[PDB]
Amino acid sequence: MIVPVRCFSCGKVVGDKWESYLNLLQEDELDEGTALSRLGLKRYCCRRMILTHVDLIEKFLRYNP
Amino acid sequence: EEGPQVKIREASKDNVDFILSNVDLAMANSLRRVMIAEIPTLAIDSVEVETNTTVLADEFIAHRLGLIPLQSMDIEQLEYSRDCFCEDHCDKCSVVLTLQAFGESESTTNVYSKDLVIVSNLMGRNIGHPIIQDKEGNGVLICKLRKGQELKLTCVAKKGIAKEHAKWGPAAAIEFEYDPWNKLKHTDYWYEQDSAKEWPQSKNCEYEDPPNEGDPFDYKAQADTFYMNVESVGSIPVDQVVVRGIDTLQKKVASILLALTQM
Amino acid sequence: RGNLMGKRVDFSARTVISGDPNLELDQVGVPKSIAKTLTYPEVVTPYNIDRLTQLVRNGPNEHPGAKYVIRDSGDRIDLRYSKRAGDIQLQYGWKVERHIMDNDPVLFNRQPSLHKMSMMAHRVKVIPYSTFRLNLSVTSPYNADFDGDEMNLHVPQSEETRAELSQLCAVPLQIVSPQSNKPCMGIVQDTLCGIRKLTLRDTFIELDQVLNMLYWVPDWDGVIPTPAIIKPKPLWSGKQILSVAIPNGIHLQRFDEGTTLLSPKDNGMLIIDGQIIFGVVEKKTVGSSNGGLIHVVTREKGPQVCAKLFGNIQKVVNFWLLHNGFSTGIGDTIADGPTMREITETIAEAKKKVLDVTKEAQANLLTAKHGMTLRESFEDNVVRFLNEARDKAGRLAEVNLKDLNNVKQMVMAGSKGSFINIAQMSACVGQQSVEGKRIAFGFVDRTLPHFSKDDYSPESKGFVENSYLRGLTPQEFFFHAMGGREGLIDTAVKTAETGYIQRRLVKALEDIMVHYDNTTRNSLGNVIQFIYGEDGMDAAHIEKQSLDTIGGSDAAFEK
Amino acid sequence: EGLVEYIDAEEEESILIAMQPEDLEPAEADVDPAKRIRVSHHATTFTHCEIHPSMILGVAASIIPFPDHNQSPRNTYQSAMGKQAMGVFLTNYNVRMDTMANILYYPQKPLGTTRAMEYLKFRELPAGQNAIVAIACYSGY
Amino acid sequence: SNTLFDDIFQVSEVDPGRYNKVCRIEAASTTQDQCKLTLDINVELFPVAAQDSLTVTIASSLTRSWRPPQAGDRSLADDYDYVMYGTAYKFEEVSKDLIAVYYSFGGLLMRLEGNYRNLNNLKQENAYLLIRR
Amino acid sequence: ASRHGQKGTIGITYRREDMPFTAEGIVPDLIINPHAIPSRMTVAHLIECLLSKVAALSGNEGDASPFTDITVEGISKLLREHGYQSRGFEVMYNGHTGKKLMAQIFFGPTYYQRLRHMVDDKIHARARGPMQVLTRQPVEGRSRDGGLRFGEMERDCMIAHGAASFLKERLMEASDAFRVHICGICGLMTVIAKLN
Amino acid sequence: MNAPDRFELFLLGEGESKLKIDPDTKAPNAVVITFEKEDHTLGNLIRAELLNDRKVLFAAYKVEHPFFARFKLRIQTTEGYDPKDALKNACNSIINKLGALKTNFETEWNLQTL
Amino acid sequence: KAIPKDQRATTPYMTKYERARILGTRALQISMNAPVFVDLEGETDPLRIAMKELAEKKIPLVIRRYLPDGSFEDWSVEELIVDL
Amino acid sequence: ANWPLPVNIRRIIQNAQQTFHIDHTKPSDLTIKDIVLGVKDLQENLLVLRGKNEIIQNAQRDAVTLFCCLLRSRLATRRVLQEYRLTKQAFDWVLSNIEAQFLRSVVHPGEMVGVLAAQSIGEPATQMTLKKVTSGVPRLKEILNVAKNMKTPSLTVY
Amino acid sequence: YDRKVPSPTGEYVKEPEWVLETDGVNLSEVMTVPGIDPTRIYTNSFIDIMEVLGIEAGRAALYKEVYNVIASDGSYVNYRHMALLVDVMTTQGGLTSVTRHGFNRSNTGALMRCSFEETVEILFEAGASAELDDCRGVSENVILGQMAPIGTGAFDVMI
Amino acid sequence: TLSHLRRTNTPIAKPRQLHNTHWGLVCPAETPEGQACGLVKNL
DNA sequence: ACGATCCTCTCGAT
RNA sequence: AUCGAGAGGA
Ligand SMILES: *O[P@](=O)(OC[C@H]1O[C@@H](n2ccc(=O)[nH]c2=O)[C@H](O)[C@@H]1O)OP(=O)(O)OP(=O)(O)O
Ligand SMILES: [Mg+2]
């Protein structure tokens, strides 16, 4: 269910970095680790926020009505 | 000048690593906290939902909206709805944004904060603007729609503070260290052999002289000099969090002074 | 059983409980909502009308308010509906079912209630959020912990009823329990773990804090005591300030193993005029022990004074710890490199012993002890061999543990942990066991299909050599699992069987009481004891004293 | 192609089973002091080898990280609680009308996984969050 | 307004048994072989070592809430370096022509052995410990 | 609850400030008491943290699979390379004061579950409501606004406290309470009550 | 459902004044000032400054219960010195330093590039 | 079956249970607008009052101690010593 | 020699040791008659029963024997004088003290010992959960039921 | 075994002694055996100790026993408590179980027995043989919702 | 849900004990506490 | 013949 | 609301 707006822990807006993150993975062919750091996510409170997210919405959208 | 004195090292739109010296730890902290919790800000604190054919719940979406960072520089000239003499809200104490999104294409339409649309009269004050630091310029991903899904909202952003709610925090994260070498002996490190080889060495040590082997224990020294850094969500420029922080704390103090007086 | 001697009563409440360090031992935190429901029939009296009327005006949905107003005829004016609910002129003689307010006496209990201590009267303290809030040192009597336990509250309805709770069943009154003839409420977790640290000789505090700690103790005489040190810096010791908590007139001598009115190990204990002279403060001193600072302070200063002793000690120690911090991590379970070496081989020889016994036995050389099968004797040996092994590898580990090691650090306070825990977490876990025997041959002549038939070696029959740290091996796992289960099972049993016994005892004696001629008879009148406990002395008012005339050489008895 | 077989407890009686294939079929021709201690592959008899010991476990226990560094009963407790956990029990929870349903707002796959969670679809429908925890005596609350 | 005991001591041993800011000192007395001393000292604020010449003093003067500075320009039994206050508890008969005493400085302990102190040593709480150079 | 048989209810929430903090400015989402560890020997929990920390740092999925050669060392070795103390401790400052905490703390990320059964779903609390028609005794369950069971066991306690009056008031004035008329010759409730 | 509104953390309700000054009874020239809808931030800052004044014999503070946002500052000053004054001074000395820091920061912030 | 004020063997001292019932019963009367035989130093709670009516031996109540045979002994709250 | 008895005498003493500030340097004002006869007299005012007849007057003696032993061994002439330098005043106080306390340690008619005991045994019983004998719950059960088929019989001869 | 023993000089010393533990009982015949000290022979089979040495002894063991159960667990319980039990178990001259076969037969009013295992029946054999319940048991006054001879209800209060 | 679908019940000498032969077939840990402990198993 | 307390909830039926 | 079966909390 969608990328958390802001990190539970510290509050660093994070919801505006999901797509960026994904791209860095697929095309830039980077490892989750660096991809994160490049997105400015340097502390672990803010790294688990994205690294762990399970974008379930993409599966809820396949339900027609 | 007088006491308290700074020494910025780094600086940008978001961070401000700086040395705050010749102050009391009590203050270094009071300052730190206040930054985290009492500097005002504008944030959606009420969502009127008209249509939500989405996969997400109303309040689930409403929650996220609240979290979306909004401009807040001129917040000092926007009132607290609870103080505005209007019934509910107005353009003197709020900022109303509209969100309307329709799943048009069969290729998933995304809904960003860049889609909020200020409807109220800003009255020429820089206030309530979906803050965007994206590269592509799509501040925050609010929601996603399918074939023909609708989402029609109307939010009312109000003045608030980290205390009523964290969405109202402008600060994000604040680093804070003092006495990089434990000269002050304010801690007793945990070791397995050499507490010096097992425990890392903070960048901040470089900015201070070591302990000098045989020197006795400095039993009179207290905490001077603090190595902080304020990250900033952005509703406020970093410089401001520090200032407004200092300001607010200063006002808090003054109001007690003003208290005795009226007493 | 369920309708006559056990009924569902009105004016009862139940929720989750959680500890609250800023609540007095004898209070109980009642979540505003619950207080707004439970009520109490108070009659209108010139000594109250003002408050009563004021509440009736507050109505049933603002806390210090009320519900229902009872009149002469016996009518019930429902305060939440009633054209005349904003009217109502109270009349002396009427009744105002009011909300439960602060300081009301209430019977608070946790089930199962196999004690008196399971049901005690607490002073009400209405507070936000929705969990009953209770002082930690009220924990054990009810045998609660905060992993989810719920607790029941009952409200006295009669003026007498209240009195009966506040004079007989009050938490204060129950600190020194008659069953163990010692106290039944000590000092736990943080307060205990901390108080110890706060006490270490090495522990000193300065001005800013001292002044807070002192203030923190509510009964402070505001007289800052002179620092233990006045030299280059005026520093106070831990003992110094804690002693503020201890009232005056409390004395307490101790002497542990190496004590000596100079206790080089900061051992034993010596408290005079309510001033702690020497000895680290931990479980023996402040626990719920016999000699205890609590047993003494209850007997000497009074139940209430001692009731307070808790909060004070807590408020101070807690604060101090709130600022010293304390924690634990894997690190705390890691043993000196050369140690694990000495340990691993400590076991290595245990195995060789078992092996050397085994070969002996298989040669028929063994000499069977009397009454035991050469087979029985064999087993018993190995089991002994392996137990010792575990215990020494364990001891071996316990010595590394530096005084800074948090685990050891709690064990020393006596706030959690024991040799065993360390020994297993750090060195070898141990020999698993089901039905008092080492793991059996569920399979034909073997333990698992991973061993060869006939194999009594330790690994094969349940000896978990590894530590919880190093990690177990499949077989080890499975085995340790078997025992694990045996445990959980008799766990479920040892509960019912006991629950039953708890009753048969209760029914059997139920009606026995100490009559007015100091005799002890049951309903029939049939004397059971001519003097209760054979001395007609109440269990709570007793303590282990030494009869100085029995021991010592004949010469010393004379000298 | 006969590279595997289905054995029931009865036939199990007549077989010898090696745990790890590797670690149990090399010839004995220095050892990491932090690794647990294992005995030896003493058996010129092996007829089978375990697919993987972690398989002796089942659904519930399967989600426990390092349950082999945990006291026996605590593993059983956790297994009973993993069933009271919240999360998305099904991607179509919105289209199902049933007596009570509890769903987590922002489920997170655990930073600590099990090579057996891949089959239990855990990472896909996680039940629990990855909170930053501190074991420490604080307000005493 | 008094002084109760003066004497230079020679430190024979300094023991830090699992404490990092405290050491238990045992120094003998120069002059009268009869007198010996056992004391707990905060080696962090006042180091000590192998054979030091320590000057000791007891007294009971320079109980109302403690105050601090201001008098930094007033009284000053600061003719020493290290100073402590405490409460004495037991007076013991080491037997023979010797007698000892015990003081507790908030846990920091001291035992004094001699004899002419029967008079010069108090019998109550009051008791400061002064040490210099 | 964690994933290691360690459950616990919340006891209070603290806002970011009042919380102890990391020099980096990181603060905990949750704080558990060290005391719930020595005895439960639930070490994996500790380990998992060591691991989950390193993992989040290096964006690597932490492998806490059972029978593997994964050591607390190999991990601590990895976490140090990441500029952190090899065990999980991290100097922390007291939120109120800003000062340092004399005791470093085990700090890291750990997977925690949100169990069902939430206070508000349990808070029942009655003060004389509806009673059973058959026994004239309070009804069961809270969904019905019933009463709490003052069963056998609770009674014994009251008896033990010697609080006679209270008992009567519990087993009568609250719950069953009824007035019956009896024949002064054959103690049977066979007396026709014609009150008027 | 038994949770109090967040704003009760910084907004005085009815019959609540920012300060209450009761004379301590144990000591002389002692006063216990209770603060309303204020937490550690102020409490500790004022406690610390109040301890710079050499005519101050005592000064501590406590939030008796986290649930509620209020605290107590205790003050004892040298005969003839009114703690209320000892309080006044402190708040000022505090504001002044604060202003100062405000400036000096703003100065430096301007010499910065970025 | 009565017992003269003499030959009285029961405890001169008042039992806790006796005083808790005495305290309750007087506290109750006081709660019903009944005359107070003491001077209130400013007390309002019935019980708290009744406690003070006992502390000044001014509670006109007598305890009847039944023995186990049937007989008994009447003791007055004025006689009974209240240590506890 | 360590047995639970009412009135912790040791304490009362310590509570005189500093309530009257007793100096171990000057001599007491105690008469050997004072102590000896005093201790004796104290033993007359303990009481647990008050019948004036033989039978009961003899029970009363029994129920106090032990405590008294404690009492005598503690309040002995040397001791009083050499062990804790009491004074006619302190000592005289210590006595009046014990009496009262004793009287306070007596059970109150009403005390429901039946239950109080039942529970005092049931509780610590529900704390039991585990050198080859039948113990714990099972055994306790064996006992209470008064079984005849006990699993671990045994005879211990000397 | 370990046994403390007064030494000629006064102090208690440890004079270990040989003792035979048995895996089977027959008290009646072993005391008589020579060499053993029949003064001390013992058994955990209180029943047997009863039948052979009298009941006052049986009570002793009965306690000696219970005690060991509770103390083997490190736990302590004041004498009186267990005392009362044993005694209650020992006043009727025999060994009366805490089972129904023992104390519910007791001689008590019908209602008490009612609240334990054989209600129905107990009340019939009670009706058949017109039993008169004093109503002085706590368990019965609880059934009639009246005060009982408890702390608060032992003494009566009067004007 | 997975766990429910993989459950086992055993109605009614020692049956709740985890047993040797169980290795490989039934989960050594997963089982309810008290009541039906050891009786309800999980493959 | 009995078997632990108290608890909330879910399904189904003359 | 009675009634019977299982699931779960401590
Ligand atoms: O949390 P838990 O139940 O511990 C406490 C108790 O409630 C009582 N109880 C529990 C379960 C049960 O089947 N029957 C009961 O009567 C017992 O007094 C429990 O003690 O159980 P655990 O997790 O084992 O407790 P802990 O050791 O604290 O982790
Ligand atoms: Mg628990």
Ligand SMILES: [Mg+2]
């Ligand atoms: Mg529990």
Ligand SMILES: [Zn+2]
């Ligand atoms: Zn973050």
Ligand SMILES: [Zn+2]
């Ligand atoms: Zn407005």
Ligand SMILES: [Zn+2]
């Ligand atoms: Zn009739």
